[PDB]
Amino acid sequence: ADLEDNMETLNDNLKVIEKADNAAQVEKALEKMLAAAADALKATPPKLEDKSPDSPEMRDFRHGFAILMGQIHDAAHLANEGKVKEAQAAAEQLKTTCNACHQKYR
Amino acid sequence: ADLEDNMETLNDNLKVIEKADNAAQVEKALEKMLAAAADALKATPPKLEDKSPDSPEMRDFRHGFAILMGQIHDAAHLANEGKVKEAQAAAEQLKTTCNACHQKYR
Ligand code: HEM
Ligand code: HEM
Ligand SMILES: [Ca+2]
Ligand SMILES: [Zn+2]
Ligand SMILES: [Zn+2]
Hints:
The structure is a homodimer.
Chain A: H1 3-19, H2 23-40, H3 56-80, H4 84-93, H5 95-105
Helix pairs in contact in A: 1-2, 2-3, 2-4, 3-4, 3-5
Bound molecules: protoporphyrin IX containing FE (2 copies), calcium ion and zinc ion (ZN) (2 copies).
Subcellular location (chains A, B): Periplasm
Keywords (chains A, B): Electron transport, Heme, Iron, Metal-binding, Periplasm, Signal, Transport
GO cellular component, one term (chains A, B): periplasmic space
C-alpha cells in the first residue's frame, strides 16, 4: 500500500485500541500497525520527492519507522501478557513519535 | 518486491557486511537489510498459503520479521558508532534468526 493508506491504517488502529474490549483485540490492532509501519518504510513522502533516495532526510525518515515499529512491537508484548491498560497507554504514547515525524516531513 | 527478491537482498547484504572495509559500508548494508525485512513482512510464504491470514503460523511469521528488524536496527547503531567489528559480529548473530524462520517455514 502507499504512504497515505498506511497512515490511515495507523490512525484507524489507534482508535480501535482506545475502544478495545480486551487484550487480544489490542494485540492484533498493534500487529496491524506494525505491518502498516513496515509497509510505509519504503515510501518517498511529497516533501522529500526532490531529494536523493540516500539523502540524510530520507534516511532520517526511514529511521522514524524503525523507531515506530520497535515501540509498536513493545506495546504488542504488553497486550500479549494480558496487560490491557498498560498496552493502551503505550499505544497513546506512540503519538509522540507520530508527531515528531509529521513536524519534520508532513 | 516479492518474498524471494527480499531474501536475496538480505543474503547479498550479509555477505557485503562480512567483507566490508569501514563502518559506513556496514551501516548502509544494514539499512538496506532493514528495508528488505520490512517489505518481506507483508508476504504469505508458499508453505503457509492455505492457512488463515491470522493463523498462529502467519503471526509467528510476521513476528520473525519484527525480531529480525530489531536486531538489524541495533547492529546499525553499532556501525553508526564506528564499531565495525562489533557490528560485524552482531550481523553474524542475525543468522540464528534467519535459520529459525527457515527451519519452520522454508
Ligand atoms: C502511529 C503513528 C502515526 C499516525 C497515527 C499517523 C497518522 C497520519 C495520518 C492520519 C496522516 C494523513 C494522511 C492520510 O492518510 O491521508 C499522516 C500523514 C503523514 N505521515 Fe503519519 N502517522 C504516524 C506516524 C508517522 C511517522 C513515524 C512518520 C515518519 C517516520 C509519518 C509520516 C507521515 C507523512 C510524510 C505524511 C503525509 C503523507 C502525504 O501527504 O502523502 N507518520 N499520518
Ligand atoms: C537472517 C536473515 C535472512 C537471510 C540472509 C535469508 C536468506 C534467504 C535466502 C537466500 C532464501 C532463498 C530465497 C531466494 O530464492 O532468493 C530465503 C528464503 C526464504 N526465507 Fe529467508 N532469510 C533471512 C531471514 C528470514 C526470516 C526472518 C524469515 C521468516 C520470518 C524468512 C523466511 C523465508 C522463507 C519462507 C523463504 C522461502 C520463500 C519461497 O520459497 O518463496 N527468512 N531466505
Ligand atoms: Ca469497546
Ligand atoms: Zn516480539
Ligand atoms: Zn535507531
